[PDB]
Amino acid sequence: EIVLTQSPGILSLSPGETATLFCKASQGGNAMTWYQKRRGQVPRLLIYDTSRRASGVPDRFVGSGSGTDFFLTINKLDREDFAVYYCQQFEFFGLGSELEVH
Amino acid sequence: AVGIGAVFLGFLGAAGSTMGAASMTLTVQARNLLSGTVWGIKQLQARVLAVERYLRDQQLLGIWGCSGKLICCTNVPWNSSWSNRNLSEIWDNMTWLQWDKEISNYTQIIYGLLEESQNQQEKNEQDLLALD
Amino acid sequence: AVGIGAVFLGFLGAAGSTMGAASMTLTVQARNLLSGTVWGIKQLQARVLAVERYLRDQQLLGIWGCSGKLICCTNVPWNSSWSNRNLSEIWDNMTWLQWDKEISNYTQIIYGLLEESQNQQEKNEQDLLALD
Amino acid sequence: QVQLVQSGAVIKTPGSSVKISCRASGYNFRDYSIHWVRLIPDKGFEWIGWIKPLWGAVSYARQLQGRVSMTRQLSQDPDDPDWGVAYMEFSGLTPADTAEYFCVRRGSCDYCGDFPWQYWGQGTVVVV
Amino acid sequence: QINSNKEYRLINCNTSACTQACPKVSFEPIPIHYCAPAG
Amino acid sequence: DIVMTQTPLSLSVTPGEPASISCRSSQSLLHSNGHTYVHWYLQKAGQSPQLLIYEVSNRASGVPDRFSGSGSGTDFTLKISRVEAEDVGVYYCEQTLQIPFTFGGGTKVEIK
Ligand SMILES: *[C@@H]1O[C@H](CO)[C@@H](O[C@@H]2O[C@H](CO)[C@@H](O[C@@H]3O[C@H](CO[C@H]4O[C@H](CO)[C@@H](O)[C@H](O)[C@@H]4O)[C@@H](O)[C@H](O[C@H]4O[C@H](CO)[C@@H](O)[C@H](O)[C@@H]4O)[C@@H]3O)[C@H](O)[C@H]2NC(C)=O)[C@H](O)[C@H]1NC(C)=O
Numbered sequence: 001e002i003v004l005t006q007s008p009g010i011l012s013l014s015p016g017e018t019a020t021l022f023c024k025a026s027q028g029g030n031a032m033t034w035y036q037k038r039r040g041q042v043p044r045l046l047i048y049d050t051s052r053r054a055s056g057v058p059d060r061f062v063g064s065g066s067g068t069d070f071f072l073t074i075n076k077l078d079r080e081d082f083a084v085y086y087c088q089q090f091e092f093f094g095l096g097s098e099l100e101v102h
Numbered sequence: 103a104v105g106i107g108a109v110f111l112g113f114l115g116a117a118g119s120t121m122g123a124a125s126m127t128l129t130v131q132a133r134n135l136l137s138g139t140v141w142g143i144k145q146l147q148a149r150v151l152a153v154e155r156y157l158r159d160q161q162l163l164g165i166w167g168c169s170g171k172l173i174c175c176t177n178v179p180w181n182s183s184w185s186n187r188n189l190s191e192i193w194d195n196m197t198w199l200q201w202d203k204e205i206s207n208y209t210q211i212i213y214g215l216l217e218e219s220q221n222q223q224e225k226n227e228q229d230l231l232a233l234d
Numbered sequence: 235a236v237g238i239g240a241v242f243l244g245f246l247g248a249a250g251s252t253m254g255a256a257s258m259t260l261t262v263q264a265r266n267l268l269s270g271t272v273w274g275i276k277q278l279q280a281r282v283l284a285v286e287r288y289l290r291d292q293q294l295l296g297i298w299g300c301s302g303k304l305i306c307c308t309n310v311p312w313n314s315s316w317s318n319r320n321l322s323e324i325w326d327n328m329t330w331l332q333w334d335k336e337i338s339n340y341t342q343i344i345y346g347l348l349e350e351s352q353n354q355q356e357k358n359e360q361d362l363l364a365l366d
Numbered sequence: 367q368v369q370l371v372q373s374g375a376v377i378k379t380p381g382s383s384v385k386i387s388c389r390a391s392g393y394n395f396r397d398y399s400i401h402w403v404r405l406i407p408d409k410g411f412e413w414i415g416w417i418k419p420l421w422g423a424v425s426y427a428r429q430l431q432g433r434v435s436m437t438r439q440l441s442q443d444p445d446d447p448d449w450g451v452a453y454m455e456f457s458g459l460t461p462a463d464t465a466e467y468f469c470v471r472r473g474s475c476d477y478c479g480d481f482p483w484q485y486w487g488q489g490t491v492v493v494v
Numbered sequence: 495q496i497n498s499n500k501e502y503r504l505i506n507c508n509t510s511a512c513t514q515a516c517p518k519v520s521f522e523p524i525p526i527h528y529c530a531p532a533g
Numbered sequence: 534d535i536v537m538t539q540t541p542l543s544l545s546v547t548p549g550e551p552a553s554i555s556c557r558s559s560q561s562l563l564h565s566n567g568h569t570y571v572h573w574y575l576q577k578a579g580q581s582p583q584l585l586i587y588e589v590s591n592r593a594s595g596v597p598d599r600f601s602g603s604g605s606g607t608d609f610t611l612k613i614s615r616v617e618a619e620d621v622g623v624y625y626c627e628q629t630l631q632i633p634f635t636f637g638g639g640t641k642v643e644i645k
């Protein structure tokens with residue numbers, strides 16, 4: 001089975017800054033998807049195929065990396081973006097990192 | 103800079119200009135002449151009418167001395183009963199649409215004259231080549 | 235004997251060979267380019283797409299200096315910003331499919347350069363013929 | 367647009383069997399797969415299985431076999447051929463199975479695997 | 495009116511039995527750009 | 534009139550980092566003859582403007598690969614790859630597709 005490990009756990013910041021999110025796989029040569037779930041809402045898609053964007057996603061969301069390392073860098077943090085962020089490869093999900101205000 | 107959109111006109115661009123400025127760019131009307139379950143047959147009978155009337159003009163051009171040269175002199179003299187105009191005017195006085203009214207009776211006499219003036223020139227080229 | 239099936243290849247025969255051996259036989263890809271109640275309309279729209287895209291290549295060839303000559307020199311110089319390669323390699327080092335990737339940005343600049351270099355040469359032939 | 371409307375929340379007993387509708391509308395239902403994702407607290411997301419609703423070919427998870435069954439019902443009328451409904455019969459519940467159940471769908475995206483799910487359901491919470 | 499009681503019939507039932515219009519299609523106008531063919 | 538907008542207003546660039554100056558027209562600038570009629574000019578303050586990039590994604594006869602042209606219809610980007618001391622000045626976007634010729638508002642680049 002592919003297992004996915006999210007690094008930072010709780011990443012606390014302030015709005016306006018830039019956060020990175022590093023997710024580590026266990027099988028190289030695949031895609032990646034990044035799911036954002038706010039508090040008490042329906043989750044939404046951000047990234048697929050490690051680089052592209054969903055329908056109606058601002059261009060401050062960008063993800064890169066290949067092999068077994070995959071980064072999701074968010075520039076110019078809003079107040080809405082403090083949510084849980086999920087990795088997903090083929091069926092397996094990460095446990096989810098959390099963004100909190102400072 | 104070099105390369106501007108002023109003198110680089112488009113399709114039918116010089117359609118009111120004189121003949122001496124319309125014969126400067128003839129290729130622009132030339133290249134936009136072939137390319138650009140019942141409404142597919144409105145597509146078929148629009149396409150095979152375009153490639154047919156293009157080949158018809160390439161055949162009347164072909165059996166004269168002009169294969170694809172697009173400007174070519176010939177050998178028939180210009181009888182003044184056709185046009186009776188001066189030469190020094192009709193390259194900077196008139197325009198092409200004013201010319202097409204002025205001559206339209208006398209086509210199919212010129213088109214018949216051009217074929218015989220080519221085929222006489224064609225076999226006479228062979229008789230020059232045959233003796234040597 | 236005389237006449238063997240070794241060097242007398244077929245359609246797309248030299249498709250991996252170098253350009254100096256592909257330009258030896260260009261006629262074999264040339265002649266197999268035109269010949270070879272609803273599934274008759276799959277026959278019609280397959281035929282009038284074949285004769286249309288053949289005439290389109292015979293028109294872009296026609297308005298340059300090359301009527302049917304199938305190999306022809308021209309007058310535009312080769313700017314090294316296009317390819318920047320040596321001459322002594324690209325007739326025995328590369329192959330044609332490797333060339334078509336190496337130049338595909340710079341077509342429609344060459345095709346636009348060729349028409350103006352013909353029409354300038356066309357009327358200048360007439361101005362030489364007109365004074366004498 | 368694409369809309370996936372689920373069913374309301376339920377209260378079940380250990381040993382019962384839920385049934386969670388997922389009514390799809392706004393796209394041709396005979397083309398795109400429908401998956402089912404269960405979200406458990408303290409465990410993250412978890413997959414269940416898809417249903418290719420042209421014929422109804424399903425495939426479940428390995429650890430949920432024998433306890434899940436997904437059927438579908440198409441739209442057999444030419445006056446309205448887009449809508450449809452997927453189902454899920456999750457049998458043999460447990461107090462360790464109380465979670466939120468989502469029906470998802472892939473995106474009409476063509477550089478895009480079956481798993482990057484674009485449009486989601488509203489979410490059905492199930493308490494045991 | 496087919497002519498106590500009062501019983502009617504459809505008006506087009508004389509001389510022209512005619513179709514429904516499928517509610518999938520719509521009678522809204524979309525723009526149409528007429529184009530000339532080549533030449 | 535067609536609008537030529539220039540982004541950004543002014544850039545303070547480090548020598549070496551790739552710089553980008555973008556300009557957007559009101560419509561596409563591809564002509565049927567085969568050339569894209571979007572140009573780019575360099576101007577020093579107190580100096581007449583000089584042409585840099587004509588027929589974009591092709592360099593001129595005298596400029597190196599420090600300048601580049603790319604983009605598509607209605608979106609034009611001038612990319613300055615390697616910055617020198619002489620790279621400072623005001624850049625202009627200008628169309629030679631239609632009449633009249635409209636110019637950009639001006640993009641000043643200075644030294645740090
Ligand atoms: C299942 O397996 C298949 C194949 O086995 C994978 O499909 C390939 O996926 C990769 C990566 O997603 C694709 O590579 C991408 O190609 C795009 C198109 O490039 C075309 O043109 C080039 C040049 O001619 C060809 O070499 C190429 O083969 C294509 O024909 C590019 O636009 C992509 O680049 C973008 O993404 C990368 C990485 O994000 C960035 O670095 C770039 O800067 C750019 O943003 C990329 O190169 C490939 O085309 C797919 N097809 C094939 C046949 O190989 C699936 O991804 C895989 N699916 C899963 C879920 O695992």
Ligand SMILES: *[C@@H]1O[C@H](CO)[C@@H](O[C@@H]2O[C@H](CO)[C@@H](O)[C@H](O)[C@H]2NC(C)=O)[C@H](O)[C@H]1NC(C)=O
Nearest residue numbers: 495496497502503504505506507508509510511
């Ligand atoms: C078909 O039926 C229609 C409906 O009745 C006929 O129309 C009427 O005919 C009567 C004849 O007695 C007239 O008095 C009415 O004025 C008609 N109605 C209208 C609205 O005109 C029609 O005549 C019939 N025959 C045909 C050939 O159409």
Ligand SMILES: *[C@@H]1O[C@H](CO)[C@@H](O)[C@H](O)[C@H]1NC(C)=O
Nearest residue numbers: 184202203204205206207208
């Ligand atoms: C062409 O002929 C008709 C009658 O045959 C005549 O009326 C007309 O004037 C002629 N055209 C010209 C340009 O003389």
Ligand SMILES: *[C@@H]1O[C@H](CO)[C@@H](O)[C@H](O)[C@H]1NC(C)=O
Nearest residue numbers: 335336337338339590603604
């Ligand atoms: C053609 O242009 C594109 C961008 O315009 C460039 O990426 C590519 O390398 C060019 N082709 C060649 C052979 O240089």
